[PDB]
Amino acid sequence: GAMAPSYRVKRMDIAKNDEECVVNAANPRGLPGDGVCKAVYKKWPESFKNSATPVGTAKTVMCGTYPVIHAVGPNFSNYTESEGDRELAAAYREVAKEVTRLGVNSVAIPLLSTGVYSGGKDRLTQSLNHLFTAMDSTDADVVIYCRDKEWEKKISEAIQMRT
Numbered sequence: 669g670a671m672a673p674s675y676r677v678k679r680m681d682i683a684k685n686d687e688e689c690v691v692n693a694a695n696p697r698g699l700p701g702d703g704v705c706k707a708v709y710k711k712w713p714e715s716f717k718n719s720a721t722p723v724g725t726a727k728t729v730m731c732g733t734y735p736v737i738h739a740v741g742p743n744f745s746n747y748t749e750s751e752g753d754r755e756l757a758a759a760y761r762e763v764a765k766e767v768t769r770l771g772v773n774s775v776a777i778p779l780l781s782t783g784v785y786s787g788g789k790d791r792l793t794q795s796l797n798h799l800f801t802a803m804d805s806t807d808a809d810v811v812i813y814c815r816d817k818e819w820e821k822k823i824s825e826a827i828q829m830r831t
């Protein structure tokens with residue numbers, strides 16, 4: 669565990685993270701995909717051997733000894749708001765199980781279903797709150813990666829609000 673488990677946010681490419689493992693915003697087919705998933709594929713392509721897993725699940729594949737937790741958020745283009753909300757919360761619960769099982773002291777994590785799976789809606793608060801619901805009972809340091817300057821501020825505010 670971390671001595672004083674924290675949440676932090678950084679605005680940069682999660683492929684450059686300084687944590688003991690990474691969460692991929694994966695597709696269910698284990699394809700290279702786009703956005704975070706493509707960055708992860710370029711940095712850790714070995715981790716896509718048999719990474720395919722259903723929506724709402726996480727499957728970890730090692731790249732060397734570096735764990736890549738492939739977490740499949742729902743595509744809100746395809747799901748109802750109700751069903752997509754349930755699967756998004758479920759994917760984060762599976763991430764917390766994997767982080768715990770791996771025994772890491774830190775994890776780099778993107779906000780699932782906030783990019784091309786968002787159905788064109790702003791889901792920062794929805795996705796971040798499901799992240800907190802899942803990760804709050806873990807003792808790993810969590811570092812959230814984003815790319816948008818306004819999202820960095822909003823994520824940082826939500827972290828600081830609870831301290």
Ligand SMILES: C[C@H]1CCCCN1C(=O)c1cnccn1
Nearest residue numbers: 782783784786788789790816819
């Ligand atoms: C998926 C995007 C684009 C479509 C509208 C919804 N949307 C955002 O609000 C957003 C997400 N992530 C970072 C910055 N903005």
Ligand SMILES: [Cl-]
Nearest residue numbers: 679680681684
């Ligand atoms: Cl960067």
Ligand SMILES: [Cl-]
Nearest residue numbers: 781783784785
């Ligand atoms: Cl996404």
